Amino acid sequence: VLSEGEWQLVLHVWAKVEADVAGHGQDILIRLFKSHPETLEKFDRFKHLKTEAEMKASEDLKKHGVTVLTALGAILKKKGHHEAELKPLAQSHATKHKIPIKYLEFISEAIIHVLHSRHPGDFGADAQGAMNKALELFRKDIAAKYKELGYQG
Numbered sequence: 001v002l003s004e005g006e007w008q009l010v011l012h013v014w015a016k017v018e019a020d021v022a023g024h025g026q027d028i029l030i031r032l033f034k035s036h037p038e039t040l041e042k043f044d045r046f047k048h049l050k051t052e053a054e055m056k057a058s059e060d061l062k063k064h065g066v067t068v069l070t071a072l073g074a075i076l077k078k079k080g081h082h083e084a085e086l087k088p089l090a091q092s093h094a095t096k097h098k099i100p101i102k103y104l105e106f107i108s109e110a111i112i113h114v115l116h117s118r119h120p121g122d123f124g125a126d127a128q129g130a131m132n133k134a135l136e137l138f139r140k141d142i143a144a145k146y147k148e149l150g151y152q153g
């Protein structure tokens with residue numbers, strides 16, 4: 001359970017993201033795919049991209065980045081009361097996209113790295129810890145739905 005102070009730190013940096021959702025989404029997906037190539041292999045849509053320059057040039061990748069960050073922003077702005085938003089996301093990622101919880105850890109690491117690079121004055125250690133906690137809560141709640149469904153592993 002995040003405190004109100006923790007949530008304010010999270011949403012204060014997240015407001016900065018929403019000024020350039022597509023740029024952040026590109027940086028986060030590219031970092032994910034470069035750091036953890038097994039993740040790229042889950043996207044039939046992107047598995048043709050073999051270099052970072054090709055990733056950065058893909059308009060379809062930039063679109064999907066906005067889709068991801070729009071869904072995460074809507075979850076963060078619920079400050080934990082996010083059951084309605086998570087249900088469908090856990091269900092599709094478990095049963096259709098076949099994404100292990102560990103890859104949600106990986107994309108959480110990429111989000112934190114990109115926020116620190118783009119917003120250092122709003123992403124000091126207090127805010128990094130609060131965002132870590134918010135992303136852990138997201139993973140915890142998704143993992144409980146995976147387990148219901150037979151996919152926690």
Ligand code: HEM
Pocket residue numbers: 039040042043044045067068069071072088089092093097099103104107
């Ligand atoms: C912060 C974490 C994430 C968020 C909020 C998120 C959100 C979404 C949304 C909103 C969609 C489209 C609707 C849906 O199918 O449910 C989607 C699709 C998808 N996601 Fe995620 N996602 C996340 C992490 C991941 C990770 C880590 C992977 C793979 C490593 C992944 C793989 C996919 C795939 C394969 C699709 C279908 C893409 C396509 O072919 O159109 N997601 N995601």
